[PDB]
């Protein structure tokens, strides 16, 4: 029921008197909770929307030099003072080169040459800063019970479902109560302030590649750093690190810009988690929250409904779904309406004793049609056994 098919699915059994249960709301995991008087509800924190991520100091990812020139003075003939050397848009490097009688100077010695060029960053990766009031974790809850095989993955429609529904928990709204129809109301007490280190990380974007890099790694990137939202002439903080003015043996200081650092940024982005960006709300699909499951409002729906009449036909007979739980897919052939599936899993058929606990406890057929497809779930002991679906 959207949580039993998870390979990292967590089975929750037993709470603190049914009032508060402490759970780990993982960004990639889903936890199925089974209670004494409540159905098994799978909660999966699948959505993670980061909204209003303000820009940070973003280094240049591929720069390039402009029209460069050199100002040369002789040895003891003054230092180089370029006219573009006083221009902030042109990066320049001064050096002591050889100037001689054959080199044009009036004395053989070390003249001064300064080479300048309009070093402009052709593209820069920009790291958005995520505030703590921008996170919103979307957790889908789904009561395991009266649903078919096409509702385990068929998540199209959560408000009009009444068996599954998604609730968004934010830092402003940590406490919530999702009214699951028939089952009562599941109480979410997730701590959005206690997040998975949202203030220690930045969301760097480069080539449409969202990456939740660390704050120290984002503040340690050695690129030409545009400061803020100044989208015009960038400041280029550490802009001199992209070019190298290699002086020759004579008066030729060739300023060569470095290559594209997006490959080295991908090489440094291996240890970070790649995040998605859905516009203003960046979609981070990983994390780990801490949820207070309120099972006081959670009731067992259809408990007063009687057992089904007959014609429980196990179509698509299931097996262990990677955890020992046996997903029973049945077709209730009968017009009992709100009937209850009287199924049992036991080895000894001459005794008829209960053999194992059921995942989808209280299996109740909901449809009033002739053949109603439903999915049940049971967890028997280690080995194989007999599954009697119905009486006779």
């Amino acid at each position: 029921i959207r949580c039993i098919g998870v390979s990292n699915r967590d089975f929750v059994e037993g709470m603190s008197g049914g009032t508060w249960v402490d759970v780990v709301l993982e960004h990639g995991g889903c936890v199925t909770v089974m209670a004494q008087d409540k159905p098994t509800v799978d909660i999966e924190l699948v959505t993670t929307t980061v909204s209003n991520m303000a820009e940070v100091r973003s280094y240049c990812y591929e720069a390039s030099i402009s029209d460069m020139a050199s100002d040369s003075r002789c040895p003891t003939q003054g230092e180089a003072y370029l006219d573009k050397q006083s221009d902030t848009q042109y990066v320049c490097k001064r050096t002591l080169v050889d100037r001689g009688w054959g080199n044009g100077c009036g004395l053989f010695g070390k003249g001064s040459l300064v080479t300048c060029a309009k070093f402009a960053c052709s593209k820069k990766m920009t790291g958005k800063s995520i505030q703590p009031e921008n996170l919103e974790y979307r957790i889908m809850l789904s009561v395991h019970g009266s649903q078919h095989s096409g509702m385990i993955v068929n998540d199209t429609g959560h408000e009009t479902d009444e068996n599954r529904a998604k609730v968004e928990i934010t830092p402003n709204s940590p406490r919530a109560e999702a009214t699951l129809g028939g089952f009562g109301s599941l109480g979410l007490d997730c701590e959005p302030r206690t997040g998975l280190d949202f203030s220690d990380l930045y969301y760097l974007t480069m080539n449409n590649k969202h990456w939740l890099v660390h704050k120290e790694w984002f503040h340690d990137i050695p690129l030409p750093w545009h400061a803020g939202a100044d989208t015009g002439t960038p400041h280029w903080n550490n802009k001199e690190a992209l070019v190298e003015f290699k002086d020759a043996h004579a008066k030729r200081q060739t300023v060569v810009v470095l290559g594209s650092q997006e490959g080295a940024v991908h090489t440094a982005l291996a240890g970070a988690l790649e995040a998605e960006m859905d516009g203003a709300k960046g979609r981070l699909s990983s994390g780990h929250l801490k949820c207070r499951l309120k099972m006081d409002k959670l009731r067992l729906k259809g408990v007063s409904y009687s057992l089904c009449t007959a014609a429980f036909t196990f179509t698509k007979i299931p097996a262990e779904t990677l955890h020992g739980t046996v997903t029973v897919e049945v077709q209730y052939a009968g017009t009992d309406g709100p009937c209850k599936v009287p199924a049992q899993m036991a080895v000894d058929m001459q005794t008829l004793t209960p053999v194992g606990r059921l995942i989808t406890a209280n299996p109740v057929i909901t449809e009033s049609t002739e053949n109603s497809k439903m999915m049940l779930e049971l967890d028997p002991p280690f080995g194989d056994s007999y599954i009697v679906i119905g009486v006779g």
């Epitope: 240049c60 070093f119 920009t126 790291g127 989208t231 002439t233 280029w236």
Partner: antibody
């Protein structure tokens, strides 16, 4: 790959306000190297830039189209807008919504082009 | 005054190198480096050349840019029928304060 697709009402009335929407694939308006520029490309004339919005939403445009052009941006939708109120025959042209040059590019650098939504302004 | 004088007629032999000259001014073409937009009949212009020398990623090696004064030069060495299109120069004007595209280059690889 980042792609831009300009679309909208290609036929407009005189004195009307044309609205072209540039949808973006492979990126968003809040990117680290994004500045979505709309350029008017009339038939028989070269491309002339009319509005260039930034990641913050506001931007600078041409002064000839300053009295009629607007550069809207959809932050939640990841789309750009080129609006022309009180249009005429001279305002009808190709309206591509390319993503502009990077950070140190104080001059323009139209590396990526939009879908090229042609505009017709007739009564 | 936002006009770039470009050669509007472009032909191309099989493997022939074509030359397109986009003439600007000292304020825009002489002021900075101008790129080109190569457009199809149903497509808008895509970037070829940046700063008048640095070709974009994915651009062909036969496309070669050059800058001399206010004149940008686009050479197409080994030009084919796929080199045909609308190659129009473009540059930002220091006096204009905005980017202006040129007159175009109707390349026709016959």
């Amino acid at each position: 790959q980042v792609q831009l697709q300009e679309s909208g009402p290609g036929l407009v009335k005189p004195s009307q306000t044309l609205s072209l929407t540039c949808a973006v694939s492979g990126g968003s308006i809040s990117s680290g190297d994004s500045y979505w520029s709309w350029i008017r490309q009339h038939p028989g004339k070269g491309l002339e830039w009319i509005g260039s919005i930034y990641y913050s939403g506001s931007t600078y445009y041409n002064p000839s189209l300053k009295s009629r052009v607007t550069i809207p941006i959809d932050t939640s939708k990841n789309q750009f807008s080129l609006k022309l109120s009180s249009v005429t025959a001279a305002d009808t042209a190709v309206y591509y919504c390319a993503r502009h040059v990077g950070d140190l590019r104080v001059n323009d650098a139209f590396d990526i082009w939009g879908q090229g939504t042609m505009v017709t302004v007739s009564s | 005054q936002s006009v770039l004088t470009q050669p509007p007629s472009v032909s191309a032999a099989p493997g022939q190198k074509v030359t397109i000259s986009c003439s600007g001014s000292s304020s825009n073409i002489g002021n900075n480096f101008v790129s080109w937009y190569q457009r199809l009949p149903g497509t808008p212009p895509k970037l070829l050349i940046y700063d008048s020398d640095k070709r974009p990623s994915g651009i062909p090696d036969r496309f070669s840019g050059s800058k001399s004064g206010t004149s940008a030069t686009l050479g197409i060495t080994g030009l084919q029928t796929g080199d045909e299109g609308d190659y129009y120069c473009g540059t930002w004007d220091r006096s204009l304060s905005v980017v202006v595209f040129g007159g175009g280059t109707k390349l026709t690889v016959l």
